[PDB]
Design an enzyme around this catalytic site. Sequence first.
Site, PDB file in Angstrom:
ATOM      1  N   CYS A 129       3.670  -3.469   0.011  1.00 55.30           N
ATOM      2  CA  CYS A 129       2.209  -3.788   0.025  1.00 55.30           C
ATOM      3  C   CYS A 129       1.811  -2.297  -0.105  1.00 55.30           C
ATOM      4  O   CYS A 129       1.409  -1.534   1.115  1.00 55.30           O
ATOM      5  CB  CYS A 129       0.936  -4.511   1.359  1.00 55.30           C
ATOM      6  SG  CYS A 129      -0.071  -4.306   0.829  1.00 55.30           S
TER       7      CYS A 129
ATOM      8  N   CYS B 264      -1.743  -0.965   1.583  1.00 62.21           N
ATOM      9  CA  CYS B 264      -1.097  -0.933   3.175  1.00 62.21           C
ATOM     10  C   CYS B 264      -0.292   0.086   4.134  1.00 62.21           C
ATOM     11  O   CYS B 264      -0.677   1.215   4.858  1.00 62.21           O
ATOM     12  CB  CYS B 264      -0.393  -2.217   3.350  1.00 62.21           C
ATOM     13  SG  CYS B 264      -0.881  -4.057   3.986  1.00 62.21           S
TER      14      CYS B 264
END
Length: 113
Positions: free
Chosen positions: A38, A41
């Site tokens: 991600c 992230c």
Amino acid sequence: IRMRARYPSVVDVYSVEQFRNIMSEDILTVAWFTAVWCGPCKTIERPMEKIAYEFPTVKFAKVDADNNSEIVSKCRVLQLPTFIIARSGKMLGHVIGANPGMLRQKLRDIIKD
């Protein structure tokens, strides 16, 4: 109680029961929902390490969303990263997305008041 003699850093969460025990403790706690593949992230990893160091009275519990899908569903987490703040089983707030500055501000304001 927290573990003594520990570098301020995340605790990795691996089960639904461990998560309940963590969030039920009388420690200001941040559940950090994240995933390895991600982009947003990854961007905030280093900012989060600095936040954990700078807020040593707070516990940061890292919840990988791919390996803890039932925790994601119990908490109605809809996007990553997400942060949920709690103490003694009480919901205290959330921060959605890659917003570490907002998390820092929210923790400061909980601790101050």
